[PDB]
A paper describes a structure:
Cholesterol absorption within enterocytes is mediated by Niemann-Pick C1 Like 1 (NPC1L1), a protein primarily expressed in the intestine and the target of the cholesterol absorption inhibitor Ezetimibe. NPC1L1 is a polytopic membrane protein that contains two conserved domains: the sterol sensing domain and the NPC1 domain. The NPC1 domain resides in the amino-terminal extracellular loop and is highly conserved in all NPC1 homologues. NPC1L1 has high sequence homology (∼40%) to lysosomal NPC1, which mediates transport of LDL-derived cholesterol out of lysosomes for subsequent delivery to the endoplasmic reticulum and plasma membrane.
A recombinant form of human NPC1L1(NTD) spanning residues 22–284 was produced in High-5 cells using a baculovirus vector. According to size exclusion chromatography, NPC1L1(NTD) exists as a monomer in solution (data not shown). In the current study, we have determined the crystal structure of NPC1L1(NTD) to 2.8 Å resolution in a cholesterol free, closed form. The structure of NPC1L1(NTD), while sharing the same overall topology as NPC1(NTD), reveals a cholesterol binding pocket that is closed from solvent, suggesting a gating mechanism that relies on the movement of multiple elements around the cholesterol entrance. Comparison to the cholesterol free and bound structures of NPC1(NTD) reveals that NPC1L1(NTD) is in a closed conformation and the sterol binding pocket is occluded from solvent. Comparison of apo-NPC1L1(NTD) to the sterol bound forms of NPC1(NTD) suggests a gating model where multiple movements around the entrance to the sterol binding pocket are required to expand the entrance and allow entry of cholesterol. The cholesterol binding pocket is slightly larger than that of NPC1(NTD), suggesting broader sterol specificity. Residues near the C4 position are smaller in NPC1L1 (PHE35 and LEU216) compared to NPC1 (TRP27 and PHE203), increasing the size of the sterol binding pocket and accommodating C4 substituted sterols such as lanosterol. While the residues near the C4 position are smaller in NPC1L1 compared to NPC1, residues around the isooctyl sidechain are roughly equivalent. The addition of an ethyl group at C24 on β-sitosterol would result in an unfavorable steric clash and we were unable to observe significant competitive binding of β-sitosterol to NPC1L1(NTD).
Author numbering: 22 to 265
Write the structure that this text describes.
């Protein structure tokens, strides 16, 4: 049985929280619940749900007329599981923003079903909708490379250690990669992800005829300022901010 049959704009892959991930062994306190399979049109985001979305996924706030594919409950689970990594990237807010937006789209994008295809589900309760336990994210290769490049040189708070090296499994910083960096982030055995995420980093010639449209969102360059702040990550954290 297919789980994500409608791959359309304005259409979600999953919506709401279903509960604990059964494949995750009771070893470290799980900070996230898992999502309910819901290949349905995106929701209009209002009230409290708006503020959360605005604060947790700023780049997905599109004015009073906002649509998204994550409930209020899902946004709390999002920030919970991002808290660990967000801490490592507090030197360079642009890279931090990029990392967060990468997962925000995966969970909240009103178009998520175009680049997300759930592969495995689990029935958590009786009468309840099935729970999404594994999915694959389709990204454009350049979007992934640009996201990784903005973070590849960031230092850990008050240290010289590179943050991506603390996030690339058996590969160090030297061997680390846009592909592998993401592979770690969607890996259960690496104790980071709440569920199995499979990252496919495609070039246009691969996505042709797939019936899928890979994510190609704008990624902030750390040598450029965001909004009206007029502030940029240092040359030690950002190769593009050099010469200093
Ligand atoms: C996870 O599931 C339980 C039971 O439905 C619920 O108490 C909890 O709020 C959910 N989400 C979080 C944030 O753990
Ligand atoms: C989505 O998942 C189904 C089930 O594994 C698979 O057959 C289908 O090809 C996937 N869609 C892709 C790879 O675009």
């Amino acid at each position: 049985e297919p789980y994500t049959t409608i791959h359309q704009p304005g259409y979600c892959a999953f919506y709401d929280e279903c509960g604990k991930n059964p494949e995750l062994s009771g070893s470290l306190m799980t900070l996230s619940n898992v999502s309910c399979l819901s290949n349905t049109p995106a929701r209009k985001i209002t009230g409290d749900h708006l503020i959360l979305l605005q604060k947790i996924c700023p780049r997905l706030y599109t004015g009073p007329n906002t649509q998204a594919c994550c409930s209020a409950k899902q946004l709390v689970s999002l920030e919970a599981s991002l808290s660990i990594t967000k801490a490592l990237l507090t030197r360079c807010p642009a890279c931090s923003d990029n990392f967060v937006n990468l997962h925000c789209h995966n969970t909240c994008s009103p178009n998520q079903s175009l680049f997300i295809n759930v592969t495995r589900v689990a029935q958590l309760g009786a009468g309840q909708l099935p729970a999404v336990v594994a999915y694959e994210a389709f990204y454009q290769h350049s979007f992934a490379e640009q996201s990784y490049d903005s973070c590849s040189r960031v230092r850990v708070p008050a240290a010289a250690t590179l943050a991506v090296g603390t996030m690339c499994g058996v590969y160090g910083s030297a061997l680390c990669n846009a592909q592998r960096w993401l592979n770690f982030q969607g890996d259960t055995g690496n104790g980071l992800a709440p569920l199995d995420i499979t990252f496919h980093l495609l070039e246009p010639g691969q996505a042709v005829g797939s019936g899928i449209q890979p994510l190609n969102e704008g990624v902030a360059r750390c040598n450029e300022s965001q909004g009206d702040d007029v502030a940029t990550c240092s040359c030690q954290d950002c190769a593009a901010s050099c010469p200093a």
